[PDB]
Amino acid sequence: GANRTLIVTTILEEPYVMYRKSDKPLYGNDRFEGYCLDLLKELSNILGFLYDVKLVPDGKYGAQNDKGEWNGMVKELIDHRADLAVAPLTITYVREKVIDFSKPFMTLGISILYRKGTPIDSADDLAKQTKIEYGAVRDGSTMTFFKKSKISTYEKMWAFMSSRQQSALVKNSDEGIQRVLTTDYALLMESTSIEYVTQRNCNLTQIGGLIDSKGYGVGTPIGSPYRDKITIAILQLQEEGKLHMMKEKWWRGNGC
Ligand SMILES: CN1N=C(C(=O)O)[C@@H]2[C@@H](C(=O)O)NC[C@@H]21
Ligand SMILES: [Cl-]
Ligand SMILES: [Cl-]
């Protein structure tokens, strides 16, 4: 019979996955557009499968609590409720214990998003002061980085983030961006998203450099037969320069 339609889990995240602007409500895959949809289109052709896009119910990428329980996109793969995770899913050692990743299709690092025209120049200045609140998206890889850090400054920053019942954390990037714009708040964010936001919000800027270096990969359940095929597909898109064209399509624009 025809090849089974694969279930792709993802999360609304600009410019990776976005609702296509329309008056008439849209249904199925046509609801979405973005870098990851274009990536899913190319992978779909190379491997030869249809796909059905489903958003993660809790809107989280995935972290494990003190009870060892995962949530978010990672948990969807563990429980075999999705065949692939085509999203900016950060490749992390802790995540590699419970799911598989393709080779990375994009590189990034943690950095700080904040308003322009301030004397804040680093995470040290941010952790050393009191006026400015700061945090990260809840139950993402950036939160996990600070939660697990063994570095003194980042340990203090996590203690600050987890205080007052984690009020410094935000539900998602969009909520975090709005918090930066409307309050005295700095968002610990991955550099690829900062590049997108700062070009379209010329009053914001990146503070300091990268405090780590990671990559995004396609997530699959352990033992998935598609992992190696997906990796081969990513490599083909690199030699063809397609991944570069996709980046420019959804990021490149007029600078501030
Ligand atoms: C870009 N977004 N920012 C994040 C963060 O944790 O800062 C998330 C991270 C993850 O996979 O957890 N990569 C996609 C999400
Ligand atoms: Cl892996
Ligand atoms: Cl590193």
Task: Give the Cα-Cα-Cα angle 62, 66, 72 (nearest 5 degrees).
Answer: 15
Give 194's contacts (C-beta < 8 A, 6+ positions apart): 111, 113, 206
Q: What is the spatial distance between Cα 201 and Cα 181, in angstroms, rounded to a whole number?
A: 9
Give dist(CA 96, CA 84) in Å, integer.
15
Calpha distance 41→22 (Å, rounded): 21
Locate 107 and state its tokens.
């590189």
Cα of 98 vs centre of ligand 2, distance in Å, is: 9
Q: Using a 6 Å cutoff on CB, does residue 133 contact ligand 1?
A: no
Q: Is the shortest distance between the CB of 73 and ligand 1 below 6 Å? A: no
Domain ranges of the chain: 1-108+214-256, 109-213
User: Which of 212, 215, 217 lies closest to 110 in space, CA to CA?
Assistant: 212
d(CA 238, CA 174): 30
* Ligand 2 center from residue 100 Cα (angstroms): 4
Nearest one of 229, 226, 193, 225 to 210, comparing CA atoms: 193
DSSP string, 74-132: HHHHHTTS-SEEEEEEE--HHHHTTSEEPSPSEEE-EEEEEESS-S--SHHHHHH-SSS
CA distance 132 to 126: 7
Indicate if 109-213 has the same CATH topology as 1-108+214-256: yes
Residue with tokens 């359940």: 221
Residue 58 CB coordination number (10 Å): 15
Q: Concatenated DSSP letters for 212-256?
A: --EEEEEEE-TT-THHHHHHHHHHHHHHTTHHHHHHHHHH-----
Q: Which residues are documented as binding site for L-glutamate?
A: 88, 90, 95, 141-142, 190
**First-residue to last-residue Cα distance in the chain:** 53
Question: Which atom belonging to ligand 1 lies closest to the Cα atom of 145?
Answer: 6
Resolution as reported, in Å:
2.0
Residue position matching structure tokens 């920053």? 157
Q: Is 36 in the pocket of ligand 1 (CB under 6 A)?
A: no
Query: H-type helices in 12-78, by residue range?
Result: 35-47, 72-78
Torsional class of 93: left (φ above 0), alpha (ψ -120 to 50), beta (otherwise): alpha
Q: How far is the CA of 190 from the centre of ligand 2 (A)?
A: 21
Q: Quote the CA–CA distance of 157 and 247 in Å, as a whole number.
A: 32
CATH topology of domain 109-213: D-Maltodextrin-Binding Protein; domain 2 (3.40.190)
Method: X-ray
Distance 155 CA to ligand 3 centre (A): 16
CATH code for the domain defined by 1-108+214-256: 3.40.190.10
